[PDB]
Amino acid sequence: TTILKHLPVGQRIGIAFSGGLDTSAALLWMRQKGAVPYAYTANLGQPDEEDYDAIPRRAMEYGAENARLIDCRKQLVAEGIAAIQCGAFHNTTGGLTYFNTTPLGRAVTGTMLVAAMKEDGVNIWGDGSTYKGNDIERFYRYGLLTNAELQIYKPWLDTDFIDELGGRHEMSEFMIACGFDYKMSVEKAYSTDSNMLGATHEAKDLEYLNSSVKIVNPIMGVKFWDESVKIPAEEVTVRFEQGHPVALNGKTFSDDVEMMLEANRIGGRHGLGMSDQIENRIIEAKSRGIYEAPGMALLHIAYERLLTGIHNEDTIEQYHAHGRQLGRLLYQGRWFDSQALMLRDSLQRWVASQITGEVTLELRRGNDYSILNTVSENLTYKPESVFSPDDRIGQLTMRNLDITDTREKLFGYAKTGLLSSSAASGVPQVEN
Amino acid sequence: TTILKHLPVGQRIGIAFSGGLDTSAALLWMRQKGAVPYAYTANLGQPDEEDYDAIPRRAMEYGAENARLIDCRKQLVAEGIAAIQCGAFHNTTGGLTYFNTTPLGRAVTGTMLVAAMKEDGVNIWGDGSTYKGNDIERFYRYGLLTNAELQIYKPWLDTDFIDELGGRHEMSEFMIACGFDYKMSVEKAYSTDSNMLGATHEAKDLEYLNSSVKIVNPIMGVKFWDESVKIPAEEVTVRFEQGHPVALNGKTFSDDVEMMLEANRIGGRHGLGMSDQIENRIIEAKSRGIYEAPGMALLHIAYERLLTGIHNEDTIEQYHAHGRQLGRLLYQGRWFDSQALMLRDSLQRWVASQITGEVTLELRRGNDYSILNTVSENLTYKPESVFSPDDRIGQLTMRNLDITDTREKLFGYAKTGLLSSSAASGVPQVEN
Amino acid sequence: TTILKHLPVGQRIGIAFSGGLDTSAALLWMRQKGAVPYAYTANLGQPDEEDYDAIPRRAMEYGAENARLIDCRKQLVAEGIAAIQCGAFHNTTGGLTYFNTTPLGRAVTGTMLVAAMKEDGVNIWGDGSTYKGNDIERFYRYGLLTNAELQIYKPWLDTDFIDELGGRHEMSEFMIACGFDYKMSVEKAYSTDSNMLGATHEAKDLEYLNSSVKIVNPIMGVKFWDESVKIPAEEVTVRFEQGHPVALNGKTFSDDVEMMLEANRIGGRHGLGMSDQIENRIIEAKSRGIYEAPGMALLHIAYERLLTGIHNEDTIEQYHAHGRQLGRLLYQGRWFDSQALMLRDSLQRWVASQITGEVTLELRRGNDYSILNTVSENLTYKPESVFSPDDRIGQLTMRNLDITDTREKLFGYAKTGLLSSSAASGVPQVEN
Amino acid sequence: TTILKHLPVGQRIGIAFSGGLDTSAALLWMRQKGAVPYAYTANLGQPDEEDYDAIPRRAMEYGAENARLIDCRKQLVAEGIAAIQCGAFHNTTGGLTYFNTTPLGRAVTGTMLVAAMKEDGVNIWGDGSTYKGNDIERFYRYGLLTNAELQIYKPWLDTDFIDELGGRHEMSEFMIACGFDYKMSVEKAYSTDSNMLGATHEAKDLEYLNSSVKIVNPIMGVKFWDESVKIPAEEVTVRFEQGHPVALNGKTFSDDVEMMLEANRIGGRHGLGMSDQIENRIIEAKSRGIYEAPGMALLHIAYERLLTGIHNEDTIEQYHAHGRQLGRLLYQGRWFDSQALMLRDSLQRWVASQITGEVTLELRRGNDYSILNTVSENLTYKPESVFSPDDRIGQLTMRNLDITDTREKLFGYAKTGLLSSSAASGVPQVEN
């Protein structure tokens, strides 16, 4: 089968070693039960990571046959920018958007780490995602897409493993019993997946709808909800060239990673982009999360403001429709499937290519901001004798036949009982 | 024809008398040129109107054959609530929404005032909307829908009228010359259309993209962008029953108008809901506006938060798609056309009927707020042994055939040149 | 768990007893291994069934604790008519449509037979659908929807069962060994699922794309592809009232089942509606089928012809879009889920309610037919001074601003390299 | 203004000279009233045209300053093939499709003839389309797109012209009075627009819904409805390479025009593709037409059959949705607008690029045909141990949570009155 239920003794197993008790304990346990574990750590520019080079060394200290750090920042930012160009975000609440940052991280991580293992002749994969979430399926799909011969082994789902190593306490004691003066970190009231595009918090106390953003200590921005933290209003300019974010506050960057890093700083000072979403997981059961994505939010606002001053209505409607559909595919782990690529490619080529301009905003607290200026050499919006009042009288008169058709429909609907009353005496009323 | 180009001497002409120089001068001029003008004023609960009863009297003072005040508040709020239940809002920028408040006002005004004229045997209609905007067409459609025999006469578009009465100065002098000690009001740097659902500001200085919300003096809320205005954080609860907004902060209301009035007060203290949009008019040319809708925004946020904890993904996707399409139809003046009614009715019956619950928010400045609690007897979201790890391994394995199909597609796309590279070595790349 | 992997000894198990070796052998085997089997047979008006009453008796002869015949014809036809009103058909090839007849049969069968078992205190269900198709999942969903406590047991998927009773030969010998002078029928080169709405043929030799409709012996119509079968051209009239098919050739019926039965006869004489489709199963793997649905096809053609003479473009576009989406949900076994009901209800209320009229056709062979007449008291199509040439000049002139915007876009696209050339010298060309 | 209401005396006016009384009489009349008329005739490979070179000569005989024949066949076929690749056809009745052949002809004609006039310094355009149809607006848009300075003058809409030259009789007498022994052709009971892609018949007697295809003498195919015309069954193979039609019956062609010409012959022998549609014109009023497009129909059927054996469900759903939307844009004259190009480009790149294969059909009469074989090196359909019965049990079990959610919804809908009954006792029933 594709998924190995129990430890493949004697075989090389590649595991996404993010570091931390779960992956650390798994390395020792696998190495202990007879498997040859290889560690691969993705450099995703995590806002809460300050020493990536130390991670592969810890894997080696714990028995890894070999350990590698795969830099995925360039690809992550490129896909994040593509997501921005396509408005590929489907989970919204009252307009506030989740920027699908974890889904983007998985697309890049799942393909690059598996490709890297491919290089080292490692054909068995394993990551710590649970059998209850979306990530296990995202990694599964991206991995198999990259390596047709891939097999999956998740010690965390192996009954043998769980029997021995139940929870965090058993695992930390396991580290100690294995000869390592291990000291487990302080446990938060929620779990977090983070990368340069965003941080997603959920589980534990965030599973209760009565818990709010107040129990969260943001890692990409400030506590804007705390009236005691001072946040001075700030002006920022975002400029695009053919849809590509090239300048922030008039400054260009040597690469897009530095640009995103700066967009994150600007947005973070204000807590821009944070939202609270209840969403539908791939397995059709709901999950609740609190999300951060300051840089993505900043670019999203500027990009759409320009879009509204540049494209026609049919094109904007298609951008919203295709973007929402693509956002869902991205969330499902299908970002590289034909149905996704066709929408992504289309929006990048025909919509984003014309987004050249600059937007000036004043950021205050959280999602409270104002648009101060909008400029573009491609605007179709023009403050300024192409048509006359009489031309409009003609255009209005052309509507008469269809208006009559609708009036007759309203009469018909009232007749068959659908409407309480038509437009004859006022506002049509749908029978209740 | 339907549209009378020149004054119908001797005939009864009904005009939407909002009050103000344009309609006042038109009454005198029409009465002067030989027409019999009738005034109809819609009570829309305008936030900037404090004495509706005075308006019909001014029409009578100016020569109106008769003057009437048509109360449209109940219908306006009912349609506004329907819009909320359907998420019928299509103009969004970075998520910030325009709540189509003027379009909703026109649907109710255009049908009720024309129906009222019908009662008085008046079959000629006229309002002050320009030949350049959307309103002239909204009124046109709603009027004809209600009265098949309606004819339209807009003195403001009559060459004879414009020759004599050019601008505001000529008109005010006309009032004086006609024997009225008329005193024209202070002129703002933008025009405004307002009603109990919202206020829409545009034209004049707002036509420049360098002008911002800063030149606007909000009439439904506070200047949250001015750091000197104090705005204490405030907790608010919004509760729905089968999709109907019934309680704010635990209090119920004798009618929906009082509810909306209170939603407006709560939202207004914070400036909730204000946005700046560049949009596409019906005639396919762009327009820029700054909008207020505090109560609508408040209900919208609570309604969608509940929706996310109650409906499945396909149903939510259909709510967003149908709502955006309906929003556009609403904006086009087709709110009562079959293609709109079918979407509106559908969302009200199958989506809104299940929205029973309460949302607790903390409002701060503008659109900066936090969700504090979400409850519903209908939640499908549940913080809490229906499926096992092995059940998921099966579900994941069922994806294999299609994943292979996609891998082959990626190879094919790379072959025909579409992709630089497939997933074989990492992240697929669309050829640039 | 929900699905019992092995025989629930001692328990009452309800099985969909269509009759035939598979269900017959299963009854004996289950009764033999210690289970108490109950038989439920759905009367679906199968075109190839001539003696339904005989089936429950055979179940009793084979050991059934009890046997029942559940009449599902009325419900089947009602859902088929709803499908017609909604154009709920998504699998089309060059326009030729699959009328989702098996999916409709499952929705009705899965709910009614399980509800019937409910009555007899039977809470374990089992049908002969394979683990490779769509039916196992349709029955699963409809059954659980009707009975929350339902458990599923499919002897045909029980390793114990397969070990003993492999194929048809082992089973027929099993019948003999169990004391029944059993004689298995003639085996066809494909399998068939049939009901009053249609017959679906697939599997066996139909799995090869080189096999065609020529290997099929149609059970609802004639072999129109065989030039030797004579098929006289025939005129037929189909009349609807508020979307309901009420008359065929000027004759009304005592009930809708008789109407569908007659629609089947008319269509069958010609082989109307037959198609060959390669489709995507729920598990994302393709399947090939040859389908019959003479009556459904007849009503579909008349219904849509009327629709085109009655509804406006936006409404027709929504009918096609919603119908295709609903067709897919129907095929997935989600015909009663909220996302389906909302589309179905909407189309029935606002689109079908106005479909009152009569269409006259001449049927010849297969899908070769001609429309001879179309009438409706609700037509908006009228062969017959509402607008003048000058009104149109105005309407055309109003397009100028946007045309300029598009011309500029074409220049822009040519500039960034998207287009080889704009419209400047002729036909714009997308860079290859 | 853009549209000149009366003859521009002294100016060069370019007119689409198809030949025939209307354009011939207009040339003399314009040349007579003081204008300098230039003739441009599009070679569209009309099935009913046998001598294109003779047309410019007749224009010269009638006074044209100059006359040119612009060959548009290559471009017409290229756009027709693009339409096929995108399924850009929106008017369907019971599945039978209108292949938007006139709209495709206008896109190519309107741009190329205007571009040609551009070359000769002619900036005033005029064609014979009426102020009541779609063509006047298609030509208007395509012309202005190609030439920003274009002005339009249609003598047929000039009151002066109509006063003098009313109908066909007045015009033929005008030709005679102008010194030409003119002999007008036999008048048919309908009008026709034809090109190499198709022929569209409408107006006159076809305006009555009681007239049928029987009054039409097809110009691209045979009278398949006439039982006396013999039509031998015929086998045909259609093969594509990366979505491009390259071979018919195993033979390749020196160019696509020859390919389409042959596709037309094959389809024509059978009358394949003919349909009768009632549709919605751009001005929102219905029109009835009878259409021919034998070659387009042939390619459409083969193309879609391959599509169904090659692409996944999401991709096929997007092909149908985008194609229908694009078909409408094509019909509206917006084939080169951004909202159209984005859908067209997308379908060509991601869907059509993979359509490599061959389909074998047997054509009989009209749209009665059978699929005999389907082959493709890219099929994802495979008649032939990737997943086990137990894998499916897991996949089915994962549906439980959502099924419960739907069951609860059905209970809720029954409670609020929407449903008569839920699934508890059988088939859910929507309250009537």
Ligand SMILES: NC(=O)NCCC[C@H](N)C(=O)O
């Ligand atoms: N802490 C986490 O586990 N976050 C990862 C998932 C985030 C979000 N629910 C998603 O599926 O994208």
Ligand SMILES: NC(=O)NCCC[C@H](N)C(=O)O
């Ligand atoms: N001040 C205004 O004229 N506002 C009315 C129009 C508001 C907005 N552009 C709309 O069309 O709904």
Ligand SMILES: NC(=O)NCCC[C@H](N)C(=O)O
């Ligand atoms: N013979 C059959 O097994 N037919 C039943 C399935 C028909 C078609 N593939 C469907 O899923 O509706």
Ligand SMILES: NC(=O)NCCC[C@H](N)C(=O)O
């Ligand atoms: N005979 C014609 O005038 N045909 C041209 C129009 C065909 C069809 N109604 C269309 O608009 O494409």
Ligand SMILES: N[C@@H](CC(=O)O)C(=O)O
């Ligand atoms: N990362 C979490 C949430 C998710 O995957 O959706 C898990 O592994 O379950």
Ligand SMILES: N[C@@H](CC(=O)O)C(=O)O
């Ligand atoms: N009320 C403004 C704007 C609009 O109608 O769209 C006008 O009359 O032009």
Ligand SMILES: N[C@@H](CC(=O)O)C(=O)O
């Ligand atoms: N009835 C067949 C086909 C299907 O279910 O889709 C099976 O049981 O596999």
Ligand SMILES: N[C@@H](CC(=O)O)C(=O)O
């Ligand atoms: N060609 C016809 C029909 C159409 O244009 O739609 C006309 O000129 O009116």
